[PDB]
Design a protein around this ligand. Sequence first.
Ligand code: SF4
Lengths: 290, 628
Amino acid sequence: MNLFQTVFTGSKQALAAAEGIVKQAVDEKGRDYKVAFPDTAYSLPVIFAATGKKITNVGELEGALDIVRSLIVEEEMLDKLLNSGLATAVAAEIIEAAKYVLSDAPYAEPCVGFISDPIIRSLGVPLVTGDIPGVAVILGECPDSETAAKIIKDYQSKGLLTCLVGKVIDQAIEGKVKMGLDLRVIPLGYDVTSVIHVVTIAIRAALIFGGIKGGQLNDILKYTAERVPAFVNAFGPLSELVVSAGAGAIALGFPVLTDQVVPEVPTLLLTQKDYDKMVKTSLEARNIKI
Amino acid sequence: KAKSIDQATLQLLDKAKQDGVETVWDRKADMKVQCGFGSAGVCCRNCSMGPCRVSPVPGKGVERGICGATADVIVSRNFARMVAAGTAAHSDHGRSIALSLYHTSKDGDIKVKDENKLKEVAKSFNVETEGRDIYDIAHDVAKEGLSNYGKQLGEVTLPPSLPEKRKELWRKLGVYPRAVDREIAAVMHSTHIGCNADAEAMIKMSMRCSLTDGWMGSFMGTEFSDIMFGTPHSIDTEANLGVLEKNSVNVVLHGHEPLLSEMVVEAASDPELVELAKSVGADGINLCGMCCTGNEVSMRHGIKIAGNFMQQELAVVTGAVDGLIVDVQCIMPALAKLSKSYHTKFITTSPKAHITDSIYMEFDEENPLDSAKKILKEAILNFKNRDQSKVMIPELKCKAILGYSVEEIINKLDKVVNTQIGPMQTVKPLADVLVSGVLRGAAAVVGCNNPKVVQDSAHIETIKGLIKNDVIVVVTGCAAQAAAKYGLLQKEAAEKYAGPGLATVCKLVDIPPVLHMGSCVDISRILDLVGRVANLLGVDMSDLPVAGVAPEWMSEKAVAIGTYVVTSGIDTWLGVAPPVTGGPEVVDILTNKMEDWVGAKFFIETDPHKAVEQIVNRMNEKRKKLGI
Ligand code: SF4
């Protein structure tokens, strides 16, 4: 299975999970039931950026699966791969929205789940200033808790805002990593779809700071690529869904670095086994100056 | 039918009609319906019992020549002789280059300009370098290269980029190369009356001969030219007939051998010659190149390219060419007649290529610079005979970027290498983009023009289709010059013609979507590149999604090139049918059975859009075989 086929398989799995969870939400709560994220002004940010539509009820959430379906075209060309990554991102957002409408408190501490607009505005000032020179999106599991803690604290000591997805949260807790918004170590959630909660940070950064109106998807992608200094460090074995989510990160212009053997793409998808050089490799790949 | 897609070509054809001079198009029209027997390859003249012609349609008419040779035998022998002739042309070019290398000296006209390249080549030839004088090394390297041409005992020396698997496959098949002249002689011997009358064996002998061109003759010529005249790097130039200057002396270098054109370029900066050009009433000296010698001087110095093969006559039709200096190969003899209608001095310089009624000034290899200065002085003095009322230079020229040797490509690829990962100075970024599928493949577009095809149409259509399908294109020779004239050799072309993956790659690496890798002998560079990629991936060259295209080929050299490209394991599309349709067995060998032998085969397709589609499908199926 080559890179394109891996991304397409991951996007289809994300679509299947989104369809299942949306069906569950439709069964339990009804199509008139409200759909929203806590304290946001852009409804579902990824769908709002891609199309301009605001998802307000469960029926519209079910109708948002058509966006995911139309974004998956299985032809081995780079544009289709980027669109398939975006389909995975939209599907992950739909899954998170369904989680919020199904459970009153989908995320428990230390996971924070969705990040509200006021937090985005608070982080915007140090973002453009340079006190936050980048965003380290750490996903998966490191071979040890010690190495995960070392990498996370290396990013933290450099001022980067690091977000954690997956078992790396538990490894960092075992590694005595101090977490919080002021400490710049944000645990999003144990599921892969929780990575969307940092993606919407970038998307809304284009909506708030950039002033790009909803539906101008190419302008949003250009803004995230040229303004948001985010990158992905994917540790541990990578499923097709993880690779598809990484394709979404690449579609947003965010390079993906991993310790796994993957079909490398220069400046976009890079393998770095040496955990002692992963921080420097990511800073170089994202062109970050400390 | 239109004669060309190039507007400057069309304006000069109108001028040639107004001036009452004949062109290659006019002679093609005069030839009318060409002989069917010769077109199918079923005519034989190998002995004076003939001429013999057998039916191109099996089961009808005369079946055998007088000696009993079948249509397949006649076709296979004719094809083999074309391969032998092409191999001879390329090998003679490389032999001259090696002899020039052998005569290099510190204080002479010919020096060593790339010592690192010479040391790497010496490593490839098992020549010691440590603690040695550079010219002693150069002479030893030249001796080894010369031995490759005529050794009768032992094995020849092949470049390290050639995969071990490909060499083992050649040895098992029986096509492993011997000395170049020995293989040419073997082909000529086996086509003699009453020798080889088996099509498969004949084709295998021709493949064996073509390998000595691709991997020994052209390769050594290219690498020694780099050693003596400098490795090409990315450089700007201008292309098409508009580069001629009305108010300057115009000196057009046509042919293939680079030593003469290098010495002419050096002589053009001589203060006495510049002063002489001023004194004859010209603003200066304007050197322009055509065909492969133009490609060489343009790759290494940015000399403007006046035009490719079927434009050579039109260069004279402008009435502005004060001197036309030619060495060997692809020099239309009609130029001698044509220059009578203008003031142009048509100067032959090589004992290998005498042309009747041209001015012969033998280029002296013993004193190359002085000889080049004398020839250039004749061209400059001819400026006084210019008739400015007969001058018409089209205001059509195009910016081009070239100089993409393998070394230059590797240097460009270093830009997209993460320093914390590495390694540097490899083809690894290219291998990565090919394996990931961001690039679907790489295609080489090579070859001449041919009056049978609208000039430059097939080259341009094939190149645009390939780059639109995210296939990166490397170009050589007259195809490269067609791309230069059209405007494809530009960074802007990436966003104008390329597909998404290739556009992203071009933006990241800062290269045009079409890479000009030099002259016809520089096709060896392409082999080198492919070999490196294969050696980096641990596979044979036949496992890669690569292809070669000759949309508008005419020469025996093109036949030899396609043969050795296929024998190396690279599928080749021919835009002009070779004279083999009369032999069904030969057609079946070249287009079907060759894949069993060397993993690649010929594709005959005269429609460029269909050729692009077939190339994409073949690359995709090879990718699926490879798992990428
Ligand atoms: S070699 Fe045979 S087929 Fe050819 S001309 Fe002589 S007799 Fe005829």
